Amino acid sequence: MDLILLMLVAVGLNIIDIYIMIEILIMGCTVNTIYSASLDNDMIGLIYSLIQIIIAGVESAIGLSILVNYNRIRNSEEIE
Amino acid sequence: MLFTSLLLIIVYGSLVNKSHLLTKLINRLGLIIIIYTLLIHLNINTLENLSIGINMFNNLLLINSFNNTIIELILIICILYVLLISFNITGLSIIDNLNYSKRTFIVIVLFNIIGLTLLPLVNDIMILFIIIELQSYSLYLLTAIFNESHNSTKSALYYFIVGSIASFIILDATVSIYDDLGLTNIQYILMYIDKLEIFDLLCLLFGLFIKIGLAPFYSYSITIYSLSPTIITNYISLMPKLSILTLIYIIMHYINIVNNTDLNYVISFLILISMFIGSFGGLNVIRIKTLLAYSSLLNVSYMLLAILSNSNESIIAYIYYIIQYSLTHINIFSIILVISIYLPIMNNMLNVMITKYSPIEYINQLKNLFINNIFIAIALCISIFSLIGIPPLTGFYGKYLVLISGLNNGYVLLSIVLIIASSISTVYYATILKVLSFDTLSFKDIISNNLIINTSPENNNNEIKPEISNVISYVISSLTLIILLIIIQYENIVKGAYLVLLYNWV
Amino acid sequence: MLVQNLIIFNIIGIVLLVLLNNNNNGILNKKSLLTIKNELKLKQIGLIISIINILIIIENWIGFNSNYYGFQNIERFLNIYWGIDGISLLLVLLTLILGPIAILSNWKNLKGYYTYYVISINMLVILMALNFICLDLVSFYILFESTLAPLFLLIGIYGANNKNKAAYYVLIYTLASSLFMLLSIVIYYIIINSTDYIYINNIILSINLQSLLFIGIIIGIAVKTPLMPVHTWLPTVHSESPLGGSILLAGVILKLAIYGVIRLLLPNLSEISMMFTPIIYIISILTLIYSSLITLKQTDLKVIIAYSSISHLAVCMIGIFANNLIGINGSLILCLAHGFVSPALFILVGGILYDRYHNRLINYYQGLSTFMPIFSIYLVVFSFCNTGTPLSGNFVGEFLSITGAVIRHPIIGSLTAASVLLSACYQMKLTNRLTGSVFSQYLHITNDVTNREIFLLNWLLIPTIIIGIYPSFVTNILNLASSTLIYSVLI
Amino acid sequence: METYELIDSDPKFSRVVRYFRPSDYLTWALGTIGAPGLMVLFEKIEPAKGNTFKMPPPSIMRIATTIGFFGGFYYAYTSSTKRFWGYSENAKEVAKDRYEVKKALSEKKSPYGSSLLNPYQQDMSARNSTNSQLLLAIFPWFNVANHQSHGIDLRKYYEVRDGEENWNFTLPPLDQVKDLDVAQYKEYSNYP
Amino acid sequence: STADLYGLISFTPKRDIHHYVIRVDEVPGKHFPTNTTGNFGNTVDFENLEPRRKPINPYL
Amino acid sequence: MIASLAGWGLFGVTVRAYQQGIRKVPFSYYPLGYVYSALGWVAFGYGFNLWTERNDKLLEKRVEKLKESRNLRLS
Numbered sequence A: 001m002d003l004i005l006l007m008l009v010a011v012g013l014n015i016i017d018i019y020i021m022i023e024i025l026i027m028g029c030t031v032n033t034i035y036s037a038s039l040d041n042d043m044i045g046l047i048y049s050l051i052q053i054i055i056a057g058v059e060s061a062i063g064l065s066i067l068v069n070y071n072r073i074r075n076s077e078e079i080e
Numbered sequence B: 001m002l003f004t005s006l007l008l009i010i011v012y013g014s015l016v017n018k019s020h021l022l023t024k025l026i027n028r029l030g031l032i033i034i035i036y037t038l039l040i041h042l043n044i045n046t047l048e049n050l051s052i053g054i055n056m057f058n059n060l061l062l063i064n065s066f067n068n069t070i071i072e073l074i075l076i077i078c079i080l081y082v083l084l085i086s087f088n089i090t091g092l093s094i095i096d097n098l099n100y101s102k103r104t105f106i107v108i109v110l111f112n113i114i115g116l117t118l119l120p121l122v123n124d125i126m127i128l129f130i131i132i133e134l135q136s137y138s139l140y141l142l143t144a145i146f147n148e149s150h151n152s153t154k155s156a157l158y159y160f161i162v163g164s165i166a167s168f169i170i171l172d173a174t175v176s177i178y179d180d181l182g183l184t185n186i187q188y189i190l191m192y193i194d195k196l197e198i199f200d201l202l203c204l205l206f207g208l209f210i211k212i213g214l215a216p217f218y219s220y221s222i223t224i225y226s227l228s229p230t231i232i233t234n235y236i237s238l239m240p241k242l243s244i245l246t247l248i249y250i251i252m253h254y255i256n257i258v259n260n261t262d263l264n265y266v267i268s269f270l271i272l273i274s275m276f277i278g279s280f281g282g283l284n285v286i287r288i289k290t291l292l293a294y295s296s297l298l299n300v301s302y303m304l305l306a307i308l309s310n311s312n313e314s315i316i317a318y319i320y321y322i323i324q325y326s327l328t329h330i331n332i333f334s335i336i337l338v339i340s341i342y343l344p345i346m347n348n349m350l351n352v353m354i355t356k357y358s359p360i361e362y363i364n365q366l367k368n369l370f371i372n373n374i375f376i377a378i379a380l381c382i383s384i385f386s387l388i389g390i391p392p393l394t395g396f397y398g399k400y401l402v403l404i405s406g407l408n409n410g411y412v413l414l415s416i417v418l419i420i421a422s423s424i425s426t427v428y429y430a431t432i433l434k435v436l437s438f439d440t441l442s443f444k445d446i447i448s449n450n451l452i453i454n455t456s457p458e459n460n461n462n463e464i465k466p467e468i469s470n471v472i473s474y475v476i477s478s479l480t481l482i483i484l485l486i487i488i489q490y491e492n493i494v495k496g497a498y499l500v501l502l503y504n505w506v
Numbered sequence C: 001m002l003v004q005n006l007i008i009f010n011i012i013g014i015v016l017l018v019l020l021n022n023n024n025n026g027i028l029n030k031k032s033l034l035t036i037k038n039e040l041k042l043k044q045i046g047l048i049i050s051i052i053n054i055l056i057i058i059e060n061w062i063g064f065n066s067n068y069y070g071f072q073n074i075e076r077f078l079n080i081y082w083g084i085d086g087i088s089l090l091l092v093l094l095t096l097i098l099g100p101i102a103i104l105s106n107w108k109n110l111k112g113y114y115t116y117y118v119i120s121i122n123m124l125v126i127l128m129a130l131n132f133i134c135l136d137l138v139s140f141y142i143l144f145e146s147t148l149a150p151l152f153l154l155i156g157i158y159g160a161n162n163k164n165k166a167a168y169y170v171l172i173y174t175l176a177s178s179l180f181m182l183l184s185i186v187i188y189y190i191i192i193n194s195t196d197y198i199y200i201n202n203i204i205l206s207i208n209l210q211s212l213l214f215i216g217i218i219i220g221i222a223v224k225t226p227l228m229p230v231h232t233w234l235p236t237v238h239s240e241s242p243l244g245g246s247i248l249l250a251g252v253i254l255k256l257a258i259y260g261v262i263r264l265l266l267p268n269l270s271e272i273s274m275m276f277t278p279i280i281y282i283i284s285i286l287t288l289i290y291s292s293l294i295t296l297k298q299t300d301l302k303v304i305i306a307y308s309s310i311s312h313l314a315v316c317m318i319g320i321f322a323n324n325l326i327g328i329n330g331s332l333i334l335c336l337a338h339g340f341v342s343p344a345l346f347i348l349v350g351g352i353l354y355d356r357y358h359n360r361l362i363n364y365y366q367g368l369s370t371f372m373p374i375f376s377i378y379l380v381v382f383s384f385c386n387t388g389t390p391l392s393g394n395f396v397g398e399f400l401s402i403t404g405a406v407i408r409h410p411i412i413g414s415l416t417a418a419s420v421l422l423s424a425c426y427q428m429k430l431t432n433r434l435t436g437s438v439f440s441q442y443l444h445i446t447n448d449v450t451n452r453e454i455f456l457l458n459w460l461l462i463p464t465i466i467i468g469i470y471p472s473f474v475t476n477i478l479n480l481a482s483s484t485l486i487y488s489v490l491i
Numbered sequence D: 001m002e003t004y005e006l007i008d009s010d011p012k013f014s015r016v017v018r019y020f021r022p023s024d025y026l027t028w029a030l031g032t033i034g035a036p037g038l039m040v041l042f043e044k045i046e047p048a049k050g051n052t053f054k055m056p057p058p059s060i061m062r063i064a065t066t067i068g069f070f071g072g073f074y075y076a077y078t079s080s081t082k083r084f085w086g087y088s089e090n091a092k093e094v095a096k097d098r099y100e101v102k103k104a105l106s107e108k109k110s111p112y113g114s115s116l117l118n119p120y121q122q123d124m125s126a127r128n129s130t131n132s133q134l135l136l137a138i139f140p141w142f143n144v145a146n147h148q149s150h151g152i153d154l155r156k157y158y159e160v161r162d163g164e165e166n167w168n169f170t171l172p173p174l175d176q177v178k179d180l181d182v183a184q185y186k187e188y189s190n191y192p
Numbered sequence E: 001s002t003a004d005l006y007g008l009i010s011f012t013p014k015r016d017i018h019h020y021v022i023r024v025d026e027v028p029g030k031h032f033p034t035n036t037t038g039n040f041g042n043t044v045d046f047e048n049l050e051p052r053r054k055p056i057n058p059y060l
Numbered sequence F: 001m002i003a004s005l006a007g008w009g010l011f012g013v014t015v016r017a018y019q020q021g022i023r024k025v026p027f028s029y030y031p032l033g034y035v036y037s038a039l040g041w042v043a044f045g046y047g048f049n050l051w052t053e054r055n056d057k058l059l060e061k062r063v064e065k066l067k068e069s070r071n072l073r074l075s
């Protein structure tokens, strides 16, 4: 069911919904890293997992700021 | 030098008052920083010492002669770009003040230069993910530096989403390699190069192919380059390719150890499509930056053929091609920024709107450049004929060396296709030359008192006032003659490329 | 003492013209004295430069040994080796001779920018001349395609109404085809590590690889001679390019394909050249026959001359691919003779009639001998030279090329004799119309051929007659060089 | 390849600064004043605003000197480092280094010096700082620890070279020198 | 001479899974942050370590 | 080496001369610019010659090892 690109329907029809999809996709990689590190008893993989969480948080902030300013520009006359 | 000086500039810029003059002088400070960085790097890093390859910072980074050459190229090209914002490009306040409006312009560039230089040096999958995001985030900020521009913010929104998906693919590939092997250091992974899924590295390359606008992911790159300001498009369309292509060559160098034929075919398939879209795509377009975006896609495809072959001749071909293409890229965008002073002023059909961010936006805005400035027009013609591949310009030798690597490794189909694509792309390349000069003899006896340059006041009616500032005109003059007169020193330059080794030794 | 002096002097010549004309361009609103009389003092300097270029090769000609086998005047310059043999020496002289002739043709018939035109013409003459004295494939290709950039701008700026279409045709036809020749050159540098003339001539490659290399090289050559069916660009370019551009294109550029066969095919791909010879003859014979019949239906005056060059160079291709000395010498003789008669026909059509009436349609002209007797004398004489009438160099070239073709292939090579009839059919039908009947009702009486146009016609006619009556001036130089190109094992 | 004797693969920050030649301070001073000079030079080449020369404000001159001060020191630091690495002529540095090491050995003191870092941290610190000068132009990182991974053998300091006989240095065996790995694991093999 | 020179440089030596360059100069595990002596599965003795493979410098 | 640096200085004059045409000034405008331009590329030419001379030494040393590798292959 994945090869027919079923996930393209589960994503909503708003720009912020695309942002949510990216966070979920990146979160799946981090969960996989924790899964492998825990089985191996490897703290190096848990270091990688922590880095992925911190880096993904930075990505969300930058993307939101661009989207905030993009919404600001349209409602920017502010004559009142 | 970069990191320490960046912190000082960050604090200093926020302390002094907000003004165009201080921002321009701060931009010159950034120019000195990059120049000092180049001097320090050249003092300690040499080609001979780095031939073996030296690990750094607990083997997280690995520098060799191949990596060092690109870093030196990155610093040099960044110096030429800062000259645009550190000096006048047209001499007119209404046009030039855009570069001096944003104080964080030089700060964001210094952030990206750190990412660009460290990316080819990555030796761990963890630091690979960290650095690729460091470079990607800096590009998003630079694309959105003009936050009062609707197109600039829209492009950055597009850039963020496409790059984030590519970063996820890159992260997904590295995580899958860790699951199979449990190791994060690349050199440790090379011990198991014959026991890991080699198509996981193809997933890694797919993320890198997105970040360089390769087909089928070309569409976002063309849209972003056309909408972004010319001063921003000049950076974001060249700098990411300097570092990512170098990293792709290293990854392909490791992949060729197992020599997976299926891996080569998939990359060949993407190169074949990129040559089709790169050539036929630019045939029917009216924007100059849209035309250059297709030109960028086509030339990256030519370099990828050298990268895919990954042999001794590929090192010579790639190093030469990336250096000469960057110089041609700088020269063309430098001329485009300057020639905005020859635009006629209305004093209407098609209701054409031109903004201050992209004064030159259409190919036909280059009309009568042969009459307006014969030396600048010839400089553009030399650059365009280099992209075509007319010998003995720098462009011909780049394609000549790429063909050598492609045909030596047996890529007969791609070599023939790249030459058909070159002929097809010559059509839109020649269109630029047609606009510049083909109406010279009919418009020689014409009067133009409505040009932008005509609005510039004179000093005393006796001073010989040049139309162009000293710095930008000198850079165009230097780059044009290097492209034209490469035959004089071609033999020695290739000998320098002979000594760039990626673990060849003997 | 040749390439170094030729490049340095011409580069200094280019700089000298640029400094003088572009000194006062700084929105001075000036008048200046160099621009007086349509920039006479700038045209004169460029004309002097072309004359000096001829003297440069003459100094090396004095030391040329016709009894010495191998390249002479071997020189290292720009990391490139340069040399001269019998075949190269004559082709260089022809290229440099047409320099002043091309400049003098557009002396006072350009709308402006004479300095740009003069520099472009001299640049093209030197670049084409250097292409005959390079000693490797890479250097051959560099000069083979370097002429495209000056020529593309020259046609697009100084061209006729359809100059835009002509500029696209010459740029794309001659580049897309030459790139296939570059592929064969790249293959040589991959498997032999060198593209030197002497080095690659001694290497025998596999019969399949020679077939692939021959096809790649012949595509670039066949488009440039040109041969059917890749010839359609040439009539468009000639009918729209300026007269000086037509002279260089018809007199020099089309001869690079014949010289390319000498350097790139015969001594290095000798085994596959024998196999390809029947195919080359079939293409060239059809090129000769079809072009002559197509010329009978053309209405543009300059297009008719353009198609005539295609038929003659088909004979040159036939002669040069014959595996005997008679065919090879005749092909080289015909190239030199065509290098003078063909520009003269363009001068008569595109330089004399066009500069007065500005219309190239054939329906406007008839009975021109009534008020232009001097024009008709040269038109008739050059028409007979173009048709291969004896006492002209074209006859010597055509007869030996036909004879060499019959020696190479008695059955199908005999068809080359049809050039004697077919060439007279279209050339005389044009000349008979232009001189016969009453003077045209659509033309006003005006000046006959002036002194400047008399000079151009006379000094293009003189070499043709000298070569035609005493071709031993040319044969003696060529005999030793041409004998090396023959491949045969008689036992 | 111009190669010389290897002194220290990871020289200490104090050792690099102490071994500065007079030219190293000269290049440090030129870097300090060069950056303000370049701002003057850039204005002379093309003024920031207008067509006439205008001196940059003193606030720009102060920050430019600070940038040049760190830039000059980094250049000097790299030049001195190559002498320890052997990439540059270091006969002056070899003689000074050998005298210091022999003096420390004669006192039964480690040439590297006592460290607050345990055996793992000393090795870890060396891995982070070794060859980090290659990226000193990108970001700084210095060896500010007394670790024992310097890529040399203390045995080569026992042989007497020319001009060192008059030094009158007596060298005890390495196993009797404090703060050395060969003289620490006496009771336990896993604890120094 | 030029043809001979280019043949040497342009020749790419064969690489496979049995012969290729790995840039590791030492064996890890001599010191761990804590609990260095684990299940005694580390059989590599650093007191009797054989000489490592050294990288080749063609310019030296 | 003087002829080499003379050529580099000649190249620097060409760059300045080409700059004058771009800026639309007479070629005698500020003649001191040619002195600055020539000396700038002389400094680049001096460094370029050192780069090429150093590269020739490195190439020869590597060629020796390549010939040894080729001899083993041809046996």
Ligand SMILES: CCCCCCCCCCCCCCCCCC(=O)OC[C@H](COP(=O)(O)OCCN)OC(=O)CCCCCCCCCCCCCCCCC
Pocket: B272, B275, B276, B279, B417, B420, B421, C229, C230
């Ligand atoms: C002697 C000298 C010879 C020199 C030239 C040699 C090459 C000659 C090429 C001959 C083929 C092209 C000439 C004929 C094509 C005419 C196109 C055409 O008539 O219309 C386009 C056609 C749709 O037809 P339509 O738009 O409705 O036009 C009305 C027709 N009654 O649209 C179509 O249906 C075309 C099919 C769809 C597009 C297919 C594209 C796939 C790739 C094609 C090859 C490109 C290879 C490029 C390689 C480099 C780039 C990878």
Ligand SMILES: CCCCCCCCCCCC(=O)OC[C@H](COP(=O)(O)OCC[N+](C)(C)C)OC(=O)CCCCCCCCCCC
Pocket: B374, B375, B378, B381, B382, B385, B390, B391, B392, B393, C011, C014, C017, C018, C021, C022, C025, C113, C114, C115, C116, C119, C120, C123, C149, C150, C153
């Ligand atoms: C053999 C090596 C030669 C290489 C260098 C040649 C000179 C380059 C031009 C610099 C000077 C300049 O641009 O000057 C312009 C000159 C002078 O023309 P003008 O009528 O006075 O100019 C008009 C000004 N008016 C109207 C006020 C008088 O015209 C040229 O452009 C001629 C030379 C270029 C011809 C070919 C162009 C494409 C080259 C592509 C290379 C692959």
Ligand SMILES: CCCCCCCCCCCC(=O)OC[C@H](COP(=O)(O)OCC[N+](C)(C)C)OC(=O)CCCCCCCCCCC
Pocket: B420, B423, B424, B427, C165, C168, C169, C172, C173, C174, C176, C177, C219, C223, C230
């Ligand atoms: C192997 C030997 C190769 C020889 C050359 C190959 C054919 C060259 C055609 C000239 C085109 C030209 O001139 O481009 C210009 C022409 C303009 O057309 P126009 O004349 O104005 O009429 C048409 C315009 N209308 C209808 C308005 C009147 O635009 C084209 O056609 C654009 C497509 C050209 C692509 C050429 C790529 C060739 C790939 C390599 C061979 C497979």
Ligand SMILES: CCCCCCCCCCCC(=O)OC[C@H](COP(=O)(O)OCC[N+](C)(C)C)OC(=O)CCCCCCCCCCC
Pocket: B481, B482, B485, B486, B487, B488, B489, B490, B491, B492, C011, C015, C018, C077, C078, C079, F003, F004, F005, F007, F008, F009, F010, F011, F014, F017, F018, F045
């Ligand atoms: C209006 C203007 C129109 C155009 C006019 C053109 C006039 C040309 C001027 C004469 C030049 C001259 O004489 O060059 C000669 C000099 C000295 O050569 P060498 O040191 O022996 O080098 C060896 C030369 N071999 C190999 C032929 C023997 O080379 C130069 O300096 C080269 C100039 C740089 C060319 C650009 C390519 C190199 C870029 C390096 C960084 C990437």
Ligand SMILES: CCCCCCCCCCCC(=O)OC[C@H](COP(=O)(O)OCC[N+](C)(C)C)OC(=O)CCCCCCCCCCC
Pocket: B470, B474, D044, D045, D046, F029, F030, F032, F033, F034, F036, F037, F038, F039, F040, F041, F043, F044
């Ligand atoms: C040792 C190596 C460096 C060379 C020494 C000189 C450095 C420059 C400082 C002098 C002052 C200056 O540049 O002054 C500025 C001048 C003049 O500009 P203008 O437009 O006439 O100004 C108008 C002034 N009026 C009104 C009086 C006329 O600009 C130039 O001449 C530009 C060329 C820069 C120097 C050459 C650099 C070459 C680098 C290329 C190598 C990769």
